[PDB]
């Protein structure tokens, strides 16, 4: 259902506070630190983004599946089901609910087994040993644990509404789109309604391009103190990416994962 965010099941239920996710991640924090878990969530978002890019998909299905990836791991352990199997099954569910089209059975392996051995072979030296019988039970299990919440609102619709109201479209929208694509790495979408993320996006992009957005932001009546920690997360997000590399580290992180028992 669209056009009414404040009566949606995502807003009523899946908006989870900061203290809730910290308690639920403690069993995952028993083996790895917060930095190792956050870099792992950075990487497995990048895997899902790589799989969505390979299938010639849109961006809306990639963000929804990443939320579906983040919703399950917010409130369940990492050692329950293998995250390497989360990446194909969430993309299929996101493309199914948006009515973009159902992928083929052999196509999805060709989507997966190409990607994990052309850009992620250092992370996975072995093959991807999973079939449809593993996926079909998982997505049937995943919707059972999602509280039947299949409709996800996205910050792109306010962001286009914000830039069409403001007027500057050509010099802001590419800068606005890359920030919202980057903020899906963090957990802000499970914490806040999306239209403050778009407002914090419009605040960042005008400062980056040195655009005087004083009179546009001062007139509107919303809470600016809750924007501030959203700004604070984003500046911590890019700062860790300066001293983080992909190929060097995760030989140790993926060796230290708690693997599910057969």
């Amino acid at each position: 259902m669209a056009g009414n965010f404040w009566q949606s099941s995502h807003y009523l239920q899946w908006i989870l506070d900061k203290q809730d996710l910290l308690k639920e991640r403690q069993k995952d924090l028993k083996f790895l630190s917060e930095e190792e878990y956050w870099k792992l969530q950075i990487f497995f978002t990048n895997v899902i983004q790589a799989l969505g890019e390979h299938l010639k998909l849109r961006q809306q299905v990639i963000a929804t599946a990443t939320v579906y990836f983040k919703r399950f791991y917010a409130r369940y352990s990492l050692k329950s089901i293998d995250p390497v199997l989360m990446a194909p099954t969430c993309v299929f569910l996101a493309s199914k609910v948006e009515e973009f089209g159902v992928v083929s059975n052999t196509r999805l392996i060709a989507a997966a087994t190409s990607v994990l051995k052309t850009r992620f072979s250092y992370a996975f030296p072995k093959e991807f040993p999973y079939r449809m019988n593993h996926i079909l039970e998982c997505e049937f299990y995943l919707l059972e644990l999602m509280d039947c919440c299949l409709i996800v609102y996205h910050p792109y619709r306010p962001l286009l509404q914000y830039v069409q109201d403001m007027g500057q479209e050509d010099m802001l929208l590419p800068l606005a789109w890359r920030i919202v694509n980057d903020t899906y790495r963090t957990d802000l979408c499970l914490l806040y309604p999306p239209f403050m993320i778009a407002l914090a996006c419009l605040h960042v992009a005008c400062v980056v391009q040195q655009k005087d957005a004083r009179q546009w932001f001062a007139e509107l009546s919303v809470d600016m103190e809750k924007i501030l920690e959203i700004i604070r997360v984003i500046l911590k997000l890019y700062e860790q990416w300066k001293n983080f590399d992909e190929r060097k580290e995760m030989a140790t992180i993926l060796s230290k994962m708690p693997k599910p028992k057969p």
């Binding site: 669209a2 056009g3 009414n4 965010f5 404040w6 009566q7 807003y11 009523l12 908006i15 983004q49 969505g52 890019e53 849109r58 961006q59 990639i62 609102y153 792109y156 619709r157 306010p158 286009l160 509404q161 109201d165 929208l173 590419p174 789109w177 890359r178 920030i179 694509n181 980057d182 309604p193 999306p194 239209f195 605040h203 960042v204 400062v207 980056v208 957005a213 004083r214 932001f217 001062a218 007139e219 509107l220 009546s221 919303v222 600016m224 924007i227 501030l228 700004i231 500046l235 890019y238 700062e239 990416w241």
Partner: protein, 235 residues
Amino acid sequence: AFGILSYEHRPLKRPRLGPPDVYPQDPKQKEDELTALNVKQGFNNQPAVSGDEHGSAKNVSFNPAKISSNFSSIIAEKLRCNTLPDTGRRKPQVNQKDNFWLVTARSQSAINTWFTDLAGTKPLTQLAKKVPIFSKKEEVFGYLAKYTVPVMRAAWLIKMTCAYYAAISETVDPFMEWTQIITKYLWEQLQKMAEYYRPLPHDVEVAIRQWDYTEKLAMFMFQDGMLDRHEFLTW
């Protein structure tokens, strides 16, 4: 779910926008237009960002000291924006063309509706857009006692009557001239129950139902500091 704040009935940017994330049915949207080409080849959905929409640039440099300094300036000028600046003292003014009717006696049924709603529970903001003003100032006391309106709602109608009379006569001290009409309307009440006791008639109870309320009207009128005390107690 009491702990969460809802902006559902709090619109953002009231001149140019509406509710924050509620999307109303715009009747001039792309999903309702039908050209000749749109029917044949289907819906035309193009990417909002030309080039690579999926690509996100993380190698661009950021200056968080610049962002926090600019954000501190934005929140500061909103405090200057939300200030409700001071203004000089002035008499309250009205627009005469829509706030009332010029003639009261055009319809007796409309008066019975308005004073019943005045005796009702509706706050007077809705009643402020249309108020009665009589031919003279004396009928307002007799009619309000007939409906037994509470005095707080009765005194607000008195505040209407002097405001409109001051505006037409601008092209006078309100205390004693209002006091004179109050006293002379209560002076003629004493002519009834004094001489009609000495040779119950229904005309006596007509005077009792209007003297009793207007006397209690006048004491609440007195405690407000609303009229002149000296000439009233002289009467």
